[PDB]
Design a protein around this nucleic acid. Structure first.
Lengths: 112, 121, 36, 59, 125, 204
RNA sequence: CCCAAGAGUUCAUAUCGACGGGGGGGUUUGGCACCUCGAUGUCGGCUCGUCACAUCCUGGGGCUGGAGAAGGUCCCAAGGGUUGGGCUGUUCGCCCAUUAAAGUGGUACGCGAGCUGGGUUCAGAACGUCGUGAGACAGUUCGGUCUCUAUCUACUGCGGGCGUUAGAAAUUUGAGUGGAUCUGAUUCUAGUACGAGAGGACCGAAUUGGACUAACCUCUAGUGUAUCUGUUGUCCCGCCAGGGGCACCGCAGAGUAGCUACGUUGGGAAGGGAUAAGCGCUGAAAGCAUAUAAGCGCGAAACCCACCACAAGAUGAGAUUUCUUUUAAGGAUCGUGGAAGAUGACCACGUUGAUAGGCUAUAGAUGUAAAGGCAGUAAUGUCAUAGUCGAGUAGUACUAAUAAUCCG
RNA sequence: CACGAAUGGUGUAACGAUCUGGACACUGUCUCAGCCAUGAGCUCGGUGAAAUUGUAGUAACGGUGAAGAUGCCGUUUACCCG
RNA sequence: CCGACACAGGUAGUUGAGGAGAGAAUCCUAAGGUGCUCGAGAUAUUCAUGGCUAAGGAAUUAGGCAAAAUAGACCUGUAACU
RNA sequence: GUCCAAGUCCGAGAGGGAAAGAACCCAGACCAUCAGCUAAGGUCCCCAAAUAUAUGCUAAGUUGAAAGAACGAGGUUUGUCU
């Protein structure tokens, strides 16, 4: 059964609950010339797309003046200790307008 | 995905701002060039002081693409602009600085000179 | 490492002469291709 | 395009062999004896019988 | 290719189709049995089953939800007053479809789409 | 050296050393040997395998009598395999155990039918010209179908529009990943022709 | 192709070869005027291909003024491949950047009942020149209607009838036919052999790409006139609240199933036989010599197998297992549907039934419904991760799949 | 070769559904096509033409021939009807 | 009425409303008049009229042909040349 | 191909042969006949008649229809001189 394969051949993670609008930091395990080191990516979660064991989430940051977006599958054997700084306060499921939008005013709305 | 007649932004202190793609090297009828692929370009801006002239023909590598590119581990990278870095007559970069981040796929192709002086990789 | 070409002769039944059958194999696997 | 030769009464008769009609699937109900189409209802006398029972009684 | 399109356009626009499906439901509610074609009846069944299902609980929200579909207070009140009281606690399938032959103008297969709880003479088997 | 399965779905797992791998689940249930064709009465060595049992209502008397000479009863899918590995007689069962972890298989399946398709979607022809530079009604036309008076005929094999449909296709050495035997799983890597819940022939 | 004065440091034939001669092909310009003027539509380009080898690349060799690598020339070989732009209506041609290569030609200078009309030969106007003039130019420029519902045959697909020697339900052998045959870069062998140095391999073994093609929708991406939400104008539901109609689906933000590529996976792998150019063994005719006359060993992407698909209407109509031996086995009509499909056909089910819908739950889409309370002067926010949908999945006969008939 | 001064010569602001060359924005014009809606088309019920037509049970190759063959010669292929 | 037709053509003048609007434009409606004298299934190929397309942005073509893009009111500002 | 001269044939001409050819070879059709002899050309089968006889050549499927070169060669049979 497909449901029997999914929850048995993919190691589930223990990451907190986040969605669109949240600001997170993801620590992955970048490999190199026979030495692996952790690297952090801090950005706003744009969308979370998927059903289970194959779902991904997209996170966007601004490395100076150039925007960088990255898509991570949640059940990656390299993701470690996702941290959450801000939280939500949006009105959409996929905040796609946040990609074609920059400046000081369109950063994020705070959640009360 | 950059092909012929595509305008790119040159990301280094060589003395150019905008460039135009002429050819995608690497075989017959090659369609596109993602990050790490070599292309032939023609300078079109040529900043006043500069080290290159407007109208010259050179070779470059695609550093940042706007098209989401997939890795082996299942992740994706997607920048916000199509950028390139010029190359010497041989397999070497001309210049000493690189503006903005680069892609990690530029490391598996022995572009250590380009990857060892960028802000982020 | 390095391979080893083993050329062994045999009495072909299609004619009756001595043909030649070579094959690239391991330097330590030529003993099992010459006994057959 | 235009036909080059007049279609003979043999070539036009060998073609009208699948142009035949199709006899309907007629059934009979062992209640009132009236014939009807299979899997269809029918009006016998101010009523509508379907499967031995009565659906409408407009008598 | 329509490998999964479970909806019949009935040779009508997206507005005309919904208008006709909302106009046939009011008729099927005010008269407990109407005579249509086969495809239109099969579409009206799938359009009217969830409405009668929602009608089994008289709330101010469900009334407005059913009104957004029927677009006629005369059918809303007649669906919530006696149709819901006569349906009772049926698991499902509040309507039946019976073919009654063919038409004459265009030779279309007809049907007699009816409510199950309002016909006391027919059972089926 | 051969089995029958049913395509369940498709998902993606991660290898033990990083990279993601797409995979397809094949509920390769226990097949039963129905008839062993020898080289003395037929003329070649092979054996039939039946996969999914039927009822006593849909089955034929001929099929009932044919499967009564065996163990389990009339099957939904019966297919004849050849060149097995272990000599086995009638009534034997092969569940999943014929495959290993890391081997290659040659899954064969019936594709899904597209119906009557034009030349552009069937063979890959491209247009007749542009879309606005005088183009009148040949945006998806085949073009020409031959030359002038020589040969004055359309050559046999001309690629034209017809029912694309779904035929039998082999997938040419998909790699096996999981061979779980308790629940018949046979998780292989790659795609498989056909819709879900479709029968497939897994040749080892 | 024949002869060879020479040129090639000396040496005619590594390479070129004058003065002369003998032929093959019918792709150029011609000669003839043999079928068509009660019409054989003419250049260029697009789509679609197919054929020859007089071979551009890949494949196998001989010679060399071949140390190696790069070359020159000749022989065998048609399986696959043979790029994108600037100028010009262009064919052609020049140029720019790549590639292993950017082949030569035929098919009415292939293809206009397949497309365009940019050029050329229609009517308007102007320039240069000729003619007194009307007018003309292998001189130039701007504009200028491309008709037809496929009868026969030829192709691509799908069915009905009958026959295979009694009839059915399945699984198959194969007489044959069709499809795919591409190739780069890097590493080790090895800076080894060779070479004074520079430079730099044969053979063999791995890694990873480009183009093409088939399948699939797990990921990315597009659509998604099922679905959800926000908002504008006006009309309607008696009024407020809340909704509905129309305005390109009114517009805007998403989107499951499905269909696709821009995505994922796989393939062109390996192994035989007879060979072409060519390389040898033994050996005479012809006491020697000689790969050949007898007999043997190698030898290419060419051919026959091999890989994939179809295939007994293969009338030469095959074989096996089981059932029934004439209203028997069984098939069909009709109905519920499809992952099947133009219509036939195909597949599952038809009450001793889970085939479709409904219902109960849920994967999931959208994003916090309506009514009411609280805060403010109000617009609004909160209690309130809720409402609506659920093209998918599972369980339940509530609804529809008859209690007919036909062939055998 | 072979402009030329009222069959006017040289310029010219504004104007032109005029002709020609170039730049920005923009886009399916294209790389390279993909998805969706209605009408036509497809099946069924009703009415119902026309152009065209010597008779036809109307194959392929090589060749001959008024010099480019469905009908001629030799070989090959092809169950009947849509 | 004039066009052979119960024909997507032509036919002088007068009245010709509301909301937003300068407007008789434009969208929805008044009074009033119509649903256009063949329909039903199904949701192939293909054509006609439309909608949306990731990256590139004329690389297409004889030619930016066709589509897309700017479009309202109020302010700031506005070159060579003449 | 074209323009003359000496003949024949087609034109205006059937029949037989070269596989099919207006002219090439034989041969000038008053009818009817299930009679015989011959011309060109042939006698293994398609397709009438020799798998007939005597002598020699060819090893190339040359050839069995028509039609080929300059220039090579230690293929073979045969005559003379030497």
């Amino acid at each position: 059964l497909l449901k029997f394969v999914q929850n048995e051949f993919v190691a589930k993670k223990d990451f907190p609950d986040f969605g669109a609008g949240d600001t997170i930091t993801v620590f992955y395990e970048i490999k190199e010339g026979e030495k692996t080191r952790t690297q952090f990516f801090k950005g706003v979660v744009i969308q979370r797309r998927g059903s289970g064991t194959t779902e991904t989430f997209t996170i966007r940051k601004m490395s100076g003046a150039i925007g960088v977006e990255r898509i991570f599958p949640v059940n990656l054997p390299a993701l470690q200790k996702i941290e959450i700084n801000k939280k939500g306060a949006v009105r959409r499921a996929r905040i796609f307008y946040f990609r074609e939008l920059t400046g000081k005013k369109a950063k994020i709305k705070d959640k009360l | 995905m950059v092909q012929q007649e595509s305008r790119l932004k040159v990301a280094d202190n060589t003395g150019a701002k905008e460039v135009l793609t002429i050819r995608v090297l690497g075989g017959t009828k090659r369609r596109y060039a993602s990050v790490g692929d070599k292309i032939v370009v023609s300078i079109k801006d040529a900043t006043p002081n500069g080290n290159v002239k407007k109208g010259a023909v050179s070779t470059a590598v695609v550093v940042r693409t706007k098209k989401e590119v997939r890795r082996a581990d299942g992740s994706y990278i997607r920048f916000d602009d199509n950028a390139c870095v010029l190359l010497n007559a041989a397999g070497e970069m001309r210049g000493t600085r690189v503006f903005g981040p680069v892609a990690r796929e530029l490391r598996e192709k022995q572009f250590m000179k380009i990857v060892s002086l960028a802000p982020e990789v | 490492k390095r391979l080893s070409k083993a050329i062994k002769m045999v009495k072909s039944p299609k004619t009756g002469a001595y043909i030649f059958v070579e094959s690239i194999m391991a330097p330590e696997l030529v003993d099992e291709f010459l006994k057959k | 395009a235009h036909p080059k030769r007049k279609t003979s009464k043999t070539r036009r008769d060998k073609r009208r062999t699948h142009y035949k009609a199709t006899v309907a699937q007629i059934a009979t109900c062992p209640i009132t004896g009236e014939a009807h189409l299979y899997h269809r209802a029918y009006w016998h006398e101010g009523k509508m019988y379907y499967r031995g029972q009565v659906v409408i009684d407009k008598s | 290719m329509r490998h999964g399109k479970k909806i019949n356009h009935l040779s009508r626009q997206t507005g005309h189709r919904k208008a006709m499906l909302a106009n046939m439901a009011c008729s099927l509610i005010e008269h407990k049995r109407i005579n249509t074609t086969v495809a239109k009846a099969k579409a009206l069944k799938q359009f009217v089953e969830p409405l009668i299902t929602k009608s089994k609980e008289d709330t101010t929200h469900n009334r407005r939800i059913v009104f957004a579909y029927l677009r006629s207070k005369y059918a809303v009140t007649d669906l919530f007053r006696d149709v819901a009281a006569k349906v009772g606690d049926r698991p499902g399938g509040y309507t039946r479809i019976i073919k009654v032959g063919n038409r004459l103008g265009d030779n279309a297969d007809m049907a007699m789409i009816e409510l199950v709880d309002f016909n006391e003479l027919y059972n089926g088997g | 050296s051969g089995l029958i399965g049913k395509k369940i779905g498709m998902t993606s797992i991660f290898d033990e050393n990083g990279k993601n791998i797409p995979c397809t689940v094949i509920e390769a249930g226990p097949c039963v040997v129905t008839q062993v064709r020898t080289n003395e009465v037929d003329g070649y060595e092979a054996l039939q395998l039946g996969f999914d049992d039927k009822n006593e209502k849909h089955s034929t008397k001929a099929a009932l009598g044919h499967f009564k000479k065996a163990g389990t009863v009339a099957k939904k899918k019966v297919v004849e395999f050849q060149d097995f590995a272990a000599a086995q007689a009638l009534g034997d069962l092969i569940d999943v155990s014929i495959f290993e972890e890391g081997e290659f298989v040659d899954v064969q399946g019936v594709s899904k039918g597209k119906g009557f398709q034009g030349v552009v979607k069937r063979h890959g022809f491209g247009g007749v010209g542009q879309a606005t530079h005088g183009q009148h009604q040949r945006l998806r036309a085949p073009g020409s179908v031959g030359a002038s008076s020589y040969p004055s005929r359309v050559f046999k094999g001309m690629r034209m529009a017809g029912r694309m449909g779904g035929d039998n296709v082999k997938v040419q050495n998909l790699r096996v990943l999981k061979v779980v035997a308790e629940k018949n799983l046979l998780v292989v890597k790659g795609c498989i022709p056909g819709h879900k819940n479709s029968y497939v022939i897994i040749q080892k």
